[PDB]
Structure formats: C-alpha cells, structure tokens
Enzyme design. Sequence first.
Site, PDB file in Angstrom:
ATOM      1  N   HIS A  85       0.696  -1.034  -0.130  1.00 55.54           N
ATOM      2  CA  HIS A  85      -0.002   0.024   0.017  1.00 55.54           C
ATOM      3  C   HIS A  85       0.866   1.371   0.030  1.00 55.54           C
ATOM      4  O   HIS A  85       1.976   1.207   0.429  1.00 55.54           O
ATOM      5  CB  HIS A  85      -1.121   0.029   1.227  1.00 55.54           C
ATOM      6  CG  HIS A  85      -0.729  -0.180   2.385  1.00 55.54           C
ATOM      7  ND1 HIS A  85      -0.409   1.284   3.195  1.00 55.54           N
ATOM      8  CD2 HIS A  85      -0.290  -1.050   3.486  1.00 55.54           C
ATOM      9  CE1 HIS A  85      -0.137   0.894   4.423  1.00 55.54           C
ATOM     10  NE2 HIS A  85      -0.090  -0.422   4.609  1.00 55.54           N
ATOM     11  N   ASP A  87       0.051   4.375   1.152  1.00 50.56           N
ATOM     12  CA  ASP A  87      -0.315   5.393   2.323  1.00 50.56           C
ATOM     13  C   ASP A  87       0.182   5.021   3.693  1.00 50.56           C
ATOM     14  O   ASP A  87       0.482   3.802   3.872  1.00 50.56           O
ATOM     15  CB  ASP A  87      -1.791   5.679   2.411  1.00 50.56           C
ATOM     16  CG  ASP A  87      -2.636   4.299   2.785  1.00 50.56           C
ATOM     17  OD1 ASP A  87      -2.408   3.154   2.284  1.00 50.56           O
ATOM     18  OD2 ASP A  87      -3.519   4.379   3.644  1.00 50.56           O
ATOM     19  N   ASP A 148       5.721   0.765   7.519  1.00 44.74           N
ATOM     20  CA  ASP A 148       4.515   0.345   6.983  1.00 44.74           C
ATOM     21  C   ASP A 148       3.832   1.232   6.012  1.00 44.74           C
ATOM     22  O   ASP A 148       3.711   2.562   6.416  1.00 44.74           O
ATOM     23  CB  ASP A 148       3.516   0.208   8.252  1.00 44.74           C
ATOM     24  CG  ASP A 148       2.209  -0.098   7.948  1.00 44.74           C
ATOM     25  OD1 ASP A 148       2.074  -0.486   6.992  1.00 44.74           O
ATOM     26  OD2 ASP A 148       1.578  -0.177   8.960  1.00 44.74           O
ATOM     27  N   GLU A 182      -5.159   2.087   2.409  1.00 46.88           N
ATOM     28  CA  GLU A 182      -5.145   0.808   3.215  1.00 46.88           C
ATOM     29  C   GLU A 182      -5.338   1.182   4.501  1.00 46.88           C
ATOM     30  O   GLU A 182      -6.102   0.604   5.015  1.00 46.88           O
ATOM     31  CB  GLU A 182      -3.979  -0.060   3.034  1.00 46.88           C
ATOM     32  CG  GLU A 182      -3.886  -1.390   3.912  1.00 46.88           C
ATOM     33  CD  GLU A 182      -3.626  -1.029   5.415  1.00 46.88           C
ATOM     34  OE1 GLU A 182      -3.176   0.097   5.694  1.00 46.88           O
ATOM     35  OE2 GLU A 182      -3.789  -1.980   6.080  1.00 46.88           O
ATOM     36  N   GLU A 183      -4.789   2.144   5.006  1.00 48.32           N
ATOM     37  CA  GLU A 183      -4.931   2.643   6.444  1.00 48.32           C
ATOM     38  C   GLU A 183      -6.213   3.103   7.184  1.00 48.32           C
ATOM     39  O   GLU A 183      -6.454   3.300   8.247  1.00 48.32           O
ATOM     40  CB  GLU A 183      -3.847   3.689   6.798  1.00 48.32           C
ATOM     41  CG  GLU A 183      -2.197   3.307   6.667  1.00 48.32           C
ATOM     42  CD  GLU A 183      -1.804   2.244   7.631  1.00 48.32           C
ATOM     43  OE1 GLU A 183      -2.532   1.907   8.747  1.00 48.32           O
ATOM     44  OE2 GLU A 183      -0.679   1.728   7.790  1.00 48.32           O
ATOM     45  N   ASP A 205       3.235  -6.561   3.513  1.00 47.89           N
ATOM     46  CA  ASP A 205       2.995  -5.500   4.705  1.00 47.89           C
ATOM     47  C   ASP A 205       2.612  -6.361   6.167  1.00 47.89           C
ATOM     48  O   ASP A 205       1.986  -6.261   7.118  1.00 47.89           O
ATOM     49  CB  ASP A 205       1.467  -5.418   4.515  1.00 47.89           C
ATOM     50  CG  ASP A 205       1.205  -3.930   5.187  1.00 47.89           C
ATOM     51  OD1 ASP A 205       1.885  -3.047   5.735  1.00 47.89           O
ATOM     52  OD2 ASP A 205      -0.339  -3.873   5.351  1.00 47.89           O
ATOM     53  N   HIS A 387       3.175   2.793  13.014  1.00 44.07           N
ATOM     54  CA  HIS A 387       2.030   4.105  13.470  1.00 44.07           C
ATOM     55  C   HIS A 387       2.300   5.261  14.632  1.00 44.07           C
ATOM     56  O   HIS A 387       1.595   6.051  15.033  1.00 44.07           O
ATOM     57  CB  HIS A 387       0.736   3.131  13.755  1.00 44.07           C
ATOM     58  CG  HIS A 387       0.201   2.415  12.780  1.00 44.07           C
ATOM     59  ND1 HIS A 387      -1.274   2.304  12.579  1.00 44.07           N
ATOM     60  CD2 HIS A 387       0.663   1.925  11.619  1.00 44.07           C
ATOM     61  CE1 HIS A 387      -1.528   1.494  11.746  1.00 44.07           C
ATOM     62  NE2 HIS A 387      -0.470   1.189  11.104  1.00 44.07           N
TER      63      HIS A 387
END
EC number: 3.4.11.4
Lengths: 416, 416
Positions: A85, A87, A148, A182-183, A205, A387
Amino acid sequence: YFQSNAMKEELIERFTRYVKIDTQSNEDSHTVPTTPGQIEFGKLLVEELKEVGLTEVTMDDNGYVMATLPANTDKDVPVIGFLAHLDTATDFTGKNVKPQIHENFDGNAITLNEELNIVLTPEQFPELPSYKGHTIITTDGTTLLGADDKAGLTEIMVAMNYLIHNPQIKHGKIRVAFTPDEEIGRGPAHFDVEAFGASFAYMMDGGPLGGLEYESFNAAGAKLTFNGTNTHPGTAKNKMRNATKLAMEFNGHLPVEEAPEYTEGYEGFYHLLSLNGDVEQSKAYYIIRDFDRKNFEARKNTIENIVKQMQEKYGQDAVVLEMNDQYYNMLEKIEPVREIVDIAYEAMKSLNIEPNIHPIRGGTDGSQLSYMGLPTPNIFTGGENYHGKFEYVSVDVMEKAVQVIIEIARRFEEQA
Amino acid sequence: YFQSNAMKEELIERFTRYVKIDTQSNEDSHTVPTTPGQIEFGKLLVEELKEVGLTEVTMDDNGYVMATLPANTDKDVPVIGFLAHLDTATDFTGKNVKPQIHENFDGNAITLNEELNIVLTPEQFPELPSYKGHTIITTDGTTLLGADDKAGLTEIMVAMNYLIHNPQIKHGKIRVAFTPDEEIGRGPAHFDVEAFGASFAYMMDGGPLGGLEYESFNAAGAKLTFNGTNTHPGTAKNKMRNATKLAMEFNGHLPVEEAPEYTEGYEGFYHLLSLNGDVEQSKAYYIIRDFDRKNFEARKNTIENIVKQMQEKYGQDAVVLEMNDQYYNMLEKIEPVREIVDIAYEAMKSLNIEPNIHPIRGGTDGSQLSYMGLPTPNIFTGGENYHGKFEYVSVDVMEKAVQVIIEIARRFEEQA
Ligand SMILES: OC[C@H]1O[C@@](CO)(O[C@H]2O[C@H](CO)[C@@H](O)[C@H](O)[C@H]2O)[C@@H](O)[C@@H]1O
Ligand SMILES: OC[C@H]1O[C@@](CO)(O[C@H]2O[C@H](CO)[C@@H](O)[C@H](O)[C@H]2O)[C@@H](O)[C@@H]1O
Ligand SMILES: OC[C@H]1O[C@@](CO)(O[C@H]2O[C@H](CO)[C@@H](O)[C@H](O)[C@H]2O)[C@@H](O)[C@@H]1O
Ligand SMILES: OC[C@H]1O[C@@](CO)(O[C@H]2O[C@H](CO)[C@@H](O)[C@H](O)[C@H]2O)[C@@H](O)[C@@H]1O
Ligand code: NA
Ligand code: NA
Ligand SMILES: [Zn+2]
Ligand SMILES: [Zn+2]
Ligand SMILES: [Zn+2]
Ligand SMILES: [Zn+2]
C-alpha cells in the site's frame, strides 16, 4: 559481497526517497485516493516501474498502480502477484519524514532528537537489542517513518529490478500492485481483481523477520436493544422492568472467560463494546470473533438462543437483536491453493529464516482480497513499532524480504 | 341535616371556584411563585380568610399565605397548623377546568366527554364502584381537576369557617398556610417555619378516605465511575480492562431482590437508574432507600465495601464513588411528638373512619417540613386519580376531612 552490496544500496536509496513523500491517507476526504500525496507517489512509481523495465504499467483513475514482469520460462506457471500500500497511518504525521540511517547498530538506546529529548529505548521496546549489528532506519522523533508499508513496496521494486536483470532465474508472469488508502479501510473497495489477473498474491505488509500470515477471524457484529418500563421507584413492585438489568442478564449468560482480555492465538470471543441506557431502554453492542467456522456459527446461535429465552420470559418486544456477519477467515480461500503458503514457508527456510506464523485476530486487506478471489498471505517487511514516532526498520531484514520474493517466484516455476 | 347541608354546600361552592383558577406551576420559571395563577389564587384566599374572620392574614413577597384562628380556650394548648398547596400538577393542563358534579353516583362508568369519547371506567379504575351513592366531581376530560390539592385547601377553609362560627367548640390557636410550587419540588424552599409559628401541623394532601402518612424513606444517591483500558480486541489479552464489565461486577455484588420492582411497604432497596459507557469508562447512577436508619447506613456501607474490594482488585483509580444523603425518614421527627399522630388516628376513629397508614416510599413536602422543625403528617382529602384527566373527588369524603380537622383541633384542647 556483490549481491548484498547492490541490494543494500538500492533498498536504502528507494526507501529513503519514498518515506520523504507525504502519503498519509484521510478518511474525511472521499476522493479515491483520499490525499494527493498518494497520487504523487503513484505517478513516481509508474515511472520507476517503466525504468526497471516492467510492461503494462498502469495507474487507474482511482490511483491503483499495476504492472507486469513478463514470464521467463517455457512452462505453464500460474500468474503470481505482489502487493503493497501507498499510504501511511492516520495516527501520526507522515509529512517531512527525516529518516536516520544507523549502521552497525549497537543494540542500545537511540536518541532520535536531542533538542526534544526523544529517545528510542530497549526498556520501552524490548525487541530493540535483537537488532544489534543491523543497519536500522529510524525517524527523527517528529514523524512516523512509513516502513509500513514503504518497506514492503521498496522490497517489491528491488526484487522486480533484480529479476529483470537476472534472466538466468526463471519465473512465470508476475503482477505487482501498489494501492491507496489501506490505512483507512478502503483499499479493497476499488481493487480490480479481474484487471490484476493473478491466481494468488503475497502482500508485503507484515512486520518483523519471518512473519507469515494466512488465517484470520470470522466476524459478526450484534446490537441488542432491551425494553423495560419505568415507574416511580416507590410504587414499582411488579410494574417496573429495568432494561439495564436485562442487558446485564443477557451478558451474564455468556461465558465470562470468552472475551478479548483473556484470549490469544486461535481463541475466539464475545466482546462487549458499549452499554448505554436506563430503566426504559438499554442498548448493548457486541462483536463475535472465531477462527473456526463451526464455533463461529455456534457463538451466533448462542446469542440467538439467549434472546429467545429472554423473549419467552419477558415478551418478544423486550429484546431486539440486530446481527450481521462482517468478514470471514481467509484460510477457507487459502486451503484450495494451500501450496501458496507452502512455497512461502519453503522459501523462508531455504534462506535460513525461521517462519513465524501469526494468526490475524481481526481482518486485513489480504484477508478481504482473499474473500474477493485473490488468496493473499501477508509476508514480513522488517518493520517495527508501526503508526508512531518510534517506528523503525532493519535494512538487513528488508534484504531477506527481497530474497523471499525472488525465491517464491523461482519456486513456482520450478514446481510447475 | 343542618350540619351536612351547610358543609356540602360550602365545600362545592369553594372547591368549584378554586379549580376554575389556573394554578399550574412551571419549573422553567424561576420566580416565586413560578406562575401568576398562584398569585391570583393566593390573593383570592387572603380576602376569603379575612371574610371568614381569621386574623394576621398575610401573603409574603413569595406568595406564601398564612393566617391565624385565635385560641378559644383558657388552657395552654400547642399551636397547631393546617397546610395545603396552591398549585396543580405539571403533567396535564389545569387551565379552564370544567368541573362536573355527579350526585348519587351509581358506581358505573362516567362519560366525561361525549364529543371526544372520554369515559371514566371501573375497568380502568377499580376503586370507582366503591363511590356508589357519593357525590363525586370529575373533569370534562380535557383537563385535570386539581382536587390535588384544592380539595385539601377547601377543607381547611370550610373547617376554619366552621370553628369561628361555632365558638362552643374550644380549641387552641391554629395557623393555616397555603403554599406555592409544591408540584415542582420547591414548596419547602421558601416556607418560613419561624413565621408560621406552630409546634406541628397537618398537611391536607393525601388521597382517599382514611389516608394517614407519617413515615418516609431515608435516601441517598450514588454515582459510580468505572475506568478501564481499551485496546484492539485482537491484542487485548492481559491489557484490556472493560469498564462496562466492572459496572456489571459492581451491580452483581448487590442483592438482586433488594430493588424497587420487588419491594413494597417498608422494604428498602438499591435502584440502578442508568448505565452508560464503553470499554474505557462507564458511569452508573443509583439511589438507595430504606425506612430503617440503621439498615440505610448499612446499605451505604455495603456500597463503600464493594468499592473498596474492587479498588484492591483493580487499583484505586478504577472505581470512583460519589455518594450523598438526600433526605430522611420523617418518623424520626414525629417520634418525640408522637401524640400528634395518635390525635389524628383517634379523630378518624371517632368519626367512624378506618385509618389507612401509607408509608411514604419517597419524600414529600410534609416529610421535608418535618426535617425543618415542623413535624407534619399528611391527611386524606378524598381525591383519586391525581395528575390526569380522570381525576375525581368525593364530596362525601371531603366532608369527612373537614370533620377530622375540627376533631383534631378540639382534641388538642381537651387533652391539654
Ligand atoms: O469438517 C469440517 C469441520 O472441521 C473444522 C474443525 O473441527 O474445521 C476444519 O475443516 C475446515 C473446513 O474444511 C477447515 O477450514 C479448518 O481449517 C479445519 O480445522 C470445523 O471448523 C469444521 O466445521
Ligand atoms: O486462483 C484462485 C481463485 O480463483 C478462483 C476463481 O473462481 O477459483 C479458481 O481456482 C480454484 C483454485 O484452484 C478452483 O478451486 C476453482 O474451481 C477455480 O474457479 C477463486 O475462487 C479463487 O480464490
Ligand atoms: O435502637 C435503635 C435501632 O432500632 C431500630 C430498629 O431495629 O429502629 C427503632 O428505633 C429508632 C430510633 O429511635 C426508631 O426511629 C424506629 O422507628 C424504631 O423501629 C433501628 O433502626 C435503630 O438503629
Ligand atoms: O414542635 C416540635 C419541633 O420543635 C423543636 C424546636 O427545637 O423541638 C422542640 O420540641 C421538641 C418536642 O417537644 C423537644 O424535644 C425539643 O427539645 C424542642 O426544642 C423541633 O426540633 C421540633 O421538630
Ligand atoms: Na480488524
Ligand atoms: Na420521592
Ligand atoms: Zn500496512
Ligand atoms: Zn498500518
Ligand atoms: Zn398535592
Ligand atoms: Zn400532586
């Protein structure tokens, strides 16, 4: 040294370029992709894919990038895919990321920012010492990193570049896709599986070394409404019916230990999300989760049976049940093509990587794509602490991820 | 026939005049009294008290009316009071009430309004047939009646007029008070007990024949806040703590049967008013009620002990308790002057009225006034179905209430 020199160099070059692009997604936007940074990243990747030499390089009107590495074999081999992904997480800023490269890491605390006194410590992150000797990349403490999933994306780019420049390594056709949003849970919503044209795929991922995920929860959500009768407290005998107590009575029928706070691994549960109300009416929200389909259905039936029992005691209108399935265990879709997990496992073992199976105690893009007709296990990328400002990644592990992609591709061809 | 003729006539004349005045209170207003109708009624009563012949007739700046019937005895007799409220319920309109007089009632259904098909039935109100032969007053179905408390107020006026015109009946000094805003809970807030100047009083705000109330609940309120920790459900083991479950755990420690919906008479209870929250935090509100002071304190200690037990299990911050006493059992204030209940009881028996003791499962103006230094039992007025369109009153019973006031006054003097 040649192979590792070339791979480490390229991994760092591409990864550091990508993390510097703000690709944070935003659910408040309803365009696809939700943010312009994702479009910039996609357009950059289209040009990078073309310079590597892939064909059929496309970027659709929704920002989904796809490309093809043509077959290099005389055999009939299934088309395999690799996904990542575009994002970064909504939890912390991904704007103006300042990656820091720490070579020959000593395994001790890292001061990310002297001025703001931000320090990445082994006390807070016990896995940190295991990276002694590795080259790790961190933030400067003011942003997240975006390993990520820019680490997985980088790995795909480096692996495809390696394959096209090593034609002695035979493989079937490979498709790659880089996807937006995706997030915020919208990745699969505009993923065109027919256009992707692969039998199965591997999502890059995961996290730490050896991670392999291919099993996920079956899930349902329920909302229970309990109806009672309020009266003056003093004159309530045989008239008042306390809806809040009915909610507690309902919960009391569930096994106390079958809850998220007491379970791990493959154990399922009922989870009470909220309870709001008074004497007249109370509303409870639950989620139901189980990896085993039979037990999942049994949990739903348990709820139905409790509701029926309470309706017989208090009347049909006293308890109202809303209940709907949400998503399913991707293992059901992996089973008919189980060799795709075996090939990934074998690939890791051949590279002296000890696989770490992680049940997915929830749902992911890979598990949803599986349901949509694209069975998709999730493979490690080398990233840790996602994150947040303490996010980091091991370049040594990124190199192992590239090797896994290459080995998976070769193995499908060899076994065809 | 002379005594009954005069009393029935006067009761109907005054009562029908009073119900036609809109005296509904309104909590949204913050003047005292809350509505102008109460001021009109008070000013009307001041003139009526003066024409009867009472002295020291006053109406204060807050709309409280007081007056004196001077002693008519050579003995030293305690000053006794009689009280009633000026306002009608907030539940239904008390504007343009159209009282209907039904003489020699047959005990069957009464059509209050032919046009709107509003009928007062014995099926809905099982006590209706017991009034066969009585003169009853109803509404026309479009308003409440205001028997609560204009019937009691009328009874006081008729009794005082009777006493002043029958000087052969000896009595000590009597004080009367007509008070605003009882129906919105503000009556005692501006009642000046020192100015009233009575040792004790009788509130004329009961209901059916024989009603005598002098015992009420001890009361406390509690608010419990439970604090937890939310996490992703899948990774919750030994990390998540569900605040809503803590609330259920707390409630589970209380005796299930000690609740309003299972109790009557003198039985106390814990009552769960509401529960709102989620995994991170949950808030429960309870009331605690008991007529017995020792048991009331024991209920509070039970709550304290449960909180302590849960704090030892989960930490001090996990459970927060707000708890405050609200009001107390008026019997504690009646006991030192218990003869005031005996005199009322004896008065009823002497008039062939069977007393009906009704524990007050809550708080009333009489119970609060008791606490303020004016012990005040509540006596019946003859009214039924208060606060709605089906409200009615028996004039026969109103006459019995007048007789009770007269007998109480004479009895205090005789026993002095
Ligand atoms: O026979 C099906 C029955 O077996 C269970 C285990 O008790 O699940 C097994 O079979 C499933 C269906 O093929 C597999 O997906 C699963 O992985 C396997 O353990 C029950 O869940 C199922 O009802
Ligand atoms: O590639 C697997 C993917 O393709 C679908 C498309 O219908 O199923 C096909 O491949 C399966 C695995 O070999 C077969 O069992 C099936 O008959 C065939 O249609 C998807 O169902 C599946 O996820
Ligand atoms: O001895 C006081 C003790 O007795 C109880 C009954 O067990 O209450 C009685 O005494 C009270 C105090 O004088 C009275 O008000 C009450 O009416 C009477 O029953 C306990 O409540 C009290 O602690
Ligand atoms: O008239 C009762 C009322 O007066 C107060 C005022 O202090 O108490 C007085 O009368 C009591 C009853 O005879 C005595 O026990 C007390 O000593 C006396 O002060 C109020 O407490 C009471 O409610
Ligand atoms: Na999830
Ligand atoms: Na009350
Ligand atoms: Zn990711
Ligand atoms: Zn993520
Ligand atoms: Zn009243
Ligand atoms: Zn009332």
